[PDB]
C-alpha cells in the first residue's frame, strides 16, 4: 500500500525531446510517429490494492494498461506492437520494460520536484518526456 501515492493523479504533457527519434528505434512508421509525434497526452495513474493502472489520452489514441508489480502482462502499444510488459518499483521508480520480436525497450517514470518525468530508452536512443499535474 501507499507504494506510487506520489505517482497518482493527472498529468499533462508540458516538453517532449527526441521522440521521434526513440519511435524510429523502436520501429514506428513514419505517418504514425507524425501524428504520435503531435500528441499532447494526459497520463492518468490510479492504484486500487495492488492493482496499477496506467492510461494515456490524446487525440491519437487512448491507451489504458493494468498490472501488478512484477508480473508480467501482455500489452498492444499506441503504435500497435504486441509486446510483453513487466513494470517493477526500483528505488522509487516505476520501470516499465516492453519485450517484443527479439528486442526490448524500458521507459521509466518517475517524480522529480512536481513533475513526472518519463525516460523512453531503445538501445542508444533516450526521449524524454515531462509532465505536470493537470
Ligand atoms: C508510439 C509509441 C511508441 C508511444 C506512444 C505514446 C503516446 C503518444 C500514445 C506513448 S505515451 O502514451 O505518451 O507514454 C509512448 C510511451 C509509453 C513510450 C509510446
Ligand atoms: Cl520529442
Same mark, same amino acid.
Request: no cysteine; net charge negative; charged share 25%.
Given at each position: 500500500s501507499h507504494m506510487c501515492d506520489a505517482f497518482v493523479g =493527472?498529468? !499533462?504533457?508540458? &516538453?517532449?525531446?527526441?521522440?521521434?527519434?526513440?519511435?524510429?528505434?523502436? @520501429?514506428?512508421? *513514419?505517418?504514425?510517429?507524425?501524428?504520435?509525434?503531435?500528441?499532447?497526452?494526459?497520463?492518468?495513474?490510479?492504484?486500487?490494492?495492488?492493482?496499477? =493502472?496506467? !492510461?494515456?489520452? &490524446?487525440?491519437?489514441?487512448?491507451?489504458?494498461?493494468?498490472?501488478?508489480? @512484477?508480473?508480467? *502482462?501482455?500489452e498492444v502499444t499506441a503504435d500497435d506492437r504486441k509486446v510483453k510488459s513487466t513494470i517493477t518499483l526500483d528505488g522509487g521508480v516505476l520501470v516499465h520494460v516492453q519485450k517484443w520480436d527479439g528486442k526490448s525497450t524500458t521507459i521509466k517514470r518517475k517524480r522529480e520536484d512536481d513533475k513526472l518525468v518519463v525516460e523512453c530508452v531503445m538501445k542508444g536512443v533516450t526521449s524524454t518526456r515531462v509532465y505536470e499535474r493537470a
Open positions: =493527472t498529468w !499533462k504533457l508540458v &516538453s517532449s525531446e527526441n521522440f521521434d527519434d526513440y519511435m524510429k528505434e523502436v @520501429g514506428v512508421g *513514419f505517418a504514425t510517429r507524425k501524428v504520435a509525434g503531435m500528441a499532447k497526452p494526459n497520463m492518468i495513474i490510479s492504484v486500487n490494492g495492488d492493482v496499477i =493502472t496506467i !492510461k494515456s489520452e &490524446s487525440t491519437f489514441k487512448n491507451t489504458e494498461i493494468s498490472f501488478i508489480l @512484477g508480473q508480467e *502482462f501482455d
